[PDB]
Amino acid sequence: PFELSGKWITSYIGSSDLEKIGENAPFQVFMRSIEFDDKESKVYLNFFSKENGICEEFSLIGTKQEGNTYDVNYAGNNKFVVSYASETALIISNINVDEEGDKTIMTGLLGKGTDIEDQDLEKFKEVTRENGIPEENIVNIIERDDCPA
Numbered sequence: 001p002f003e004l005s006g007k008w009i010t011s012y013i014g015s016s017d018l019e020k021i022g023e024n025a026p027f028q029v030f031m032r033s034i035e036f037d038d039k040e041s042k043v044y045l046n047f048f049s050k051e052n053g054i055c056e057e058f059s060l061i062g063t064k065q066e067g068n069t070y071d072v073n074y075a076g077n078n079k080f081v082v083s084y085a086s087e088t089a090l091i092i093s094n095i096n097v098d099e100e101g102d103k104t105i106m107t108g109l110l111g112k113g114t115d116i117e118d119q120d121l122e123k124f125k126e127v128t129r130e131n132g133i134p135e136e137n138i139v140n141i142i143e144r145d146d147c148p149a
């Protein structure tokens with residue numbers, strides 16, 4: 001029996017648009033926890049992000065939709081799916097349409113905290129590639145995450 005809810009920390013993030021994941025960008029997301037509430041058809045996301053170099057915390061709520069996607073508002077509109085789930089990781093695929101109407105596909109590897117399993121990393125790189133995102137568009141978040149636990 002797989003437990004998807006709980007503590008999840010971001011390891012890596014891939015993006016079709018580099019402007020969304022660099023320094024202090026909306027999508028350089030340092031995840032802390034994800035709680036799935038199938039009973040109420042919602043998902044709870046807690047994470048840190050940086051603006052002006054300082055850590056800011058967000059606690060969002062997404063709504064479960066068709067298939068096994070989730071809609072959530074943040075720096076525009078987002079539709080994400082947990083593409084992969086193991087005992088040690090989660091790989092999220094997200095499609096963001098920002099305020100300007102520009103569409104960006106992104107991927108993220110989440111783990112239980114800092115020590116990455118290569119088996120999970122290879123699946124993330126594979127998912128990222130399948131989404132048309134180049135290897136050079138992958139950022140190592142572990143090295144950038146200096147926000148509070």
Ligand SMILES: Cc1ccc(C(C)C)c(O)c1
Pocket residue numbers: 013027029045047072073074078080092094106107108
């Ligand atoms: C809406 C949304 C989508 C994706 C992520 C990470 C997987 C990068 C979020 O933190 C939030």
